[PDB]
Design a protein around this nucleic acid. Structure first.
Ligand SMILES: [Mg+2]
Ligand SMILES: [Mg+2]
Ligand SMILES: [Mg+2]
Ligand SMILES: [Mg+2]
Ligand SMILES: [Mg+2]
Ligand SMILES: [Mg+2]
Ligand SMILES: [Mg+2]
Ligand SMILES: [Mg+2]
Ligand SMILES: [Mg+2]
Ligand SMILES: [Mg+2]
Ligand SMILES: [Mg+2]
Ligand SMILES: [Mg+2]
Ligand SMILES: [Mg+2]
Ligand SMILES: [Mg+2]
Ligand SMILES: [Mg+2]
Ligand SMILES: [Mg+2]
Ligand SMILES: [Mg+2]
Ligand SMILES: [Mg+2]
Ligand SMILES: [Mg+2]
Ligand SMILES: [Mg+2]
Ligand SMILES: [Mg+2]
Ligand SMILES: [Mg+2]
Ligand SMILES: [Mg+2]
Ligand SMILES: [Mg+2]
Lengths: 77, 149
RNA sequence: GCUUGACUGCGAGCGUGACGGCGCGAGCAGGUGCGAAAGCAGGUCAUAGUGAUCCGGUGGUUCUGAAUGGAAGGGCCAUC
RNA sequence: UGAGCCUUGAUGGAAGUGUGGACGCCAGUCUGCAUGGCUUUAAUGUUUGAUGUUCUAACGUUGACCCGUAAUCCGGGUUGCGGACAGUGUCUGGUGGGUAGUUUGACUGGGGCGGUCU
RNA sequence: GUUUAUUAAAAACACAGCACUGUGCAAACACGAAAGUGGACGUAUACGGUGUGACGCCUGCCCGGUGCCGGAAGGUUAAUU
RNA sequence: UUUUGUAUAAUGGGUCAGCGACUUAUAUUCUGUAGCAAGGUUAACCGAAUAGGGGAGCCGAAGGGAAACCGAGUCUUAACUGGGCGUUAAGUUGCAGGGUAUAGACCCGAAACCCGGUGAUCUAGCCAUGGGCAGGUUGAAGGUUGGGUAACACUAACUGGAGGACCGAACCGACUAAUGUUGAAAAAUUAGCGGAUGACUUGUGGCUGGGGGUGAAAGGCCAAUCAAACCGGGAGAUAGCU
RNA sequence: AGGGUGACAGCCCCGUACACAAAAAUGCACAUGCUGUGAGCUCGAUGAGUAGGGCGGGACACGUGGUAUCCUGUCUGAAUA
RNA sequence: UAAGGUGAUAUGAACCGUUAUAACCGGCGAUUUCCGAAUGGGGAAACCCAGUGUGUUUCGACACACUAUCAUUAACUGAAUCCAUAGGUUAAUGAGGCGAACCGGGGGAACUGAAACAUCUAAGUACCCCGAGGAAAAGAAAUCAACCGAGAUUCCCCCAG
């Protein structure tokens, strides 16, 4: 399930739109990547499936907090 | 990605400076390998409280013994001396514990030779004020009274 | 030869079309050319020489202008 | 390595016994090299992009090993190989009857062909 | 040998053989938004695609057109700035 | 019924009986009718509930101009001798009807498009595991032994038992004819016919699903059907046609 | 009101108007208890990968239009009464 | 509540009742085989086969109970790695499945209309999927208004085709 474990970002639907303006159903789906992060608070490597932006969010809020969610939301990690 | 530093660190490092580096370098090498930290603002005082509770705190806590020579600004009583010789001139030298013999009962008792003037130590009159090692900065002042016996 | 009437606003009143429209028109106002003057000129002897509407361009024009003043956009006239 | 700024040598403690480079008004004297009682120039420190080597630490491993585990999966770990590449997301040019939706006029001595359409 | 079960059994398809062309292996190709899997427990004396169709004697000329392959100069040229 | 025209040898009906097609809602206009009249009327709601309340609002009493605006006038134009549209006729709300608009819109009918499902008990291909092929022929390689060579080559008897080999039942097929064609049978019967140790044939079970499968390729086959299966739904698709 | 009874019934039957009814289990209200639960005053604090922006789509009656407003797949990113 | 009763086709038989344990009706309980979410394992539904506890003047065996998965929590265990995490057993709680419409959300057609057709339409309709309640959803303004003022959301009539 292409879904960013930190932002909830899943694929969305939309059209294509040719020059002639012809709609064709499609998907935008997120830039996922699943990345090994170091915790230090846990002396372990937790490897989340994250979209960039998901990343930019840890880079700011900070891992120990992001993982604080998930835990508090039920997610495995 | 700005972040602040811990250890040194090649082309930017300085045990606590204010750098701005590509996020990769950080979330892949600096932190998760202890060398830097997200400048979470919370932090830019947590590590600026240091730059003040230090670089102007303990850099002031140095100054509490001004010149150390506080109330010793009127010479010190001359119990004995430091020696003389050459029937008129001078001949004898300071054994590795012999400029205290004089100021031998003042401040506190030691016995070490932090030599400051690398000369033959000039042989003439007697009473001389150079300095001596009293610390990594300040100085002191005292005199030398010879012994007539 | 001299000239810009191949003018601007209008138009009694006719023609001709299912319609959209197309044509003819003396005369009125302003201003203009030619003629001494009466007068003639709103293109070419007449009848073909063409493309509705939408959308957009350009100039003009305060008519419009979403709190108010502006502006954008719209309208109106000209034209592509 | 293309350009900027900061700088120390060029345009804006004397004379003699001694040297590389040169637009040198067309035959200079120089820019320095030894001595002897804000604008036309070279190197660094640097700031900024391009190119290339390499690294390792993202990431890949459909090599080997350890454990969960008597398990051809998966996961964690170790190691070896590769490595900012490959791949993927968004955007973007090309290609694309593989697939899809359609169009492909009327008149007409039947239709088509020819011809015609104001 | 195969085939239109039910108006066509053939000169049609197939075939062994020939050629072209793709593929260095996590192969190309194929099913599949993926994971997974066929190819293959195979490795270029192999695997796929295409055409020809035992065998004998042979298979000439044309690259302008279309298609395909190669090309580090220039011209034109997208998002981007 | 359709037609220029039908006794027509052009359509439809064997016959009877029952059913079977211009509706309904909301708007909108006209006509009729009733109320009130420069006025008519309320909606939701409240409700004492078909009353009464409620006048939000709609239509009408004023038009001209794109508009600002002016106003029984206004616009056109600098301005019209003028010109256009207006001022000189009552409306409005019910009720019944005639039209129209939006809805299946008078009824029945396509071939098809789309969505979700059900089908490999027929059949195509493949997978696993099992079964079958009377009888008769031909007589490859190889081997043995002689003869032969300097030795091989070669050669003769014998031995051997090859093949999408030959003939031919079962079994698999389906070339011809006749019969049958309201059949015995929605593909057969009878006489002939091809294959018959193979790319053979067959049982049981399995896998492949509809723009999909499978296909020694015919557009064949996928449950008596296939140029895109069946079932339900969109659904009263649409039908300028009958 | 209606239904039935050998044809059409206020007065034959069952009903109807009206007036009554629960040992139990429950619904809803209240008045109480139990476990909680927090109340009022003062002094604070005032929701960042967010608003905004580029690109591509989608919502707004509004089809990119001169197009505000909203959501976000991608890339970015403020101020702090 | 009662003078009549043992549902129906449907008699008959053998019976139960008449002053309150006949029947009838309602509240609360008991019992409730097998299949089915089906949950001990399996499986071609209503069948096959277990493990551990128990249980017998005949303690062979045969009957009765428990044993699915997942989530939260707790206890005890416990790798690569020694700590620690992973893992492992047990327990206590809960979920599972069914069913009208209405409701929020995730996807989302075409026929058809435009007298053809692609923008546009049909239409966020049909349909598939998830979730929930007696309703759902929405909701106490970074909303409008217009220099006056209004004061969350929801529904109705207008505004207005
Ligand atoms: Mg096509
Ligand atoms: Mg269509
Ligand atoms: Mg024709
Ligand atoms: Mg046939
Ligand atoms: Mg035949
Ligand atoms: Mg081949
Ligand atoms: Mg051929
Ligand atoms: Mg041939
Ligand atoms: Mg006829
Ligand atoms: Mg007649
Ligand atoms: Mg007849
Ligand atoms: Mg079968
Ligand atoms: Mg044979
Ligand atoms: Mg035979
Ligand atoms: Mg026969
Ligand atoms: Mg069939
Ligand atoms: Mg159907
Ligand atoms: Mg429909
Ligand atoms: Mg129909
Ligand atoms: Mg706030
Ligand atoms: Mg069971
Ligand atoms: Mg089961
Ligand atoms: Mg159409
Ligand atoms: Mg609620």
């Amino acid at each position: 399930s292409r879904v960013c474990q930190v932002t909830g970002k899943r694929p969305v639907t939309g059209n294509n739109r040719s020059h002639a303006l012809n709609a064709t159903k499609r998907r935008f789906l997120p830039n996922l990547h699943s990345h090994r992060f170091w915790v230090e608070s846990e002396k372990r490597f937790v490897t989340l499936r994250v979209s960039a932006k998901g990343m930019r969010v840890i880079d700011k809020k900070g891992i120990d907090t992001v993982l604080a969610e998930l835990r508090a939301r039920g997610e495995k990690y | 990605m700005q972040v602040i530093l811990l250890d040194k660190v090649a082309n930017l490092g300085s045990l606590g400076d204010q750098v701005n580096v590509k996020a990769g370098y950080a979330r892949n090498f600096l932190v998760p390998q202890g060398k830097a930290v997200p400048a979470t603002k919370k932090n830019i005082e947590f590590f600026e409280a240091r730059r003040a509770e230090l670089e102007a705190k303990l850099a002031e806590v140095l100054a509490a013994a001004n010149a150390r020579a506080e109330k010793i600004n009127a010479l010190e009583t001359v119990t004995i001396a430091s020696k003389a010789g050459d029937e008129g001139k001078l001949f004898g030298s300071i054994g590795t514990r012999d400029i205290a013999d004089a100021v031998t009962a003042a401040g506190v008792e030691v016995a070490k030779s932090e030599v400051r003037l690398p000369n033959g130590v000039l042989r003439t009159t007697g009473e001389h004020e150079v300095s001596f090692q009293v610390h990594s900065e300040v100085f002191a002042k005292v005199i030398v009274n010879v012994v007539a016996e």
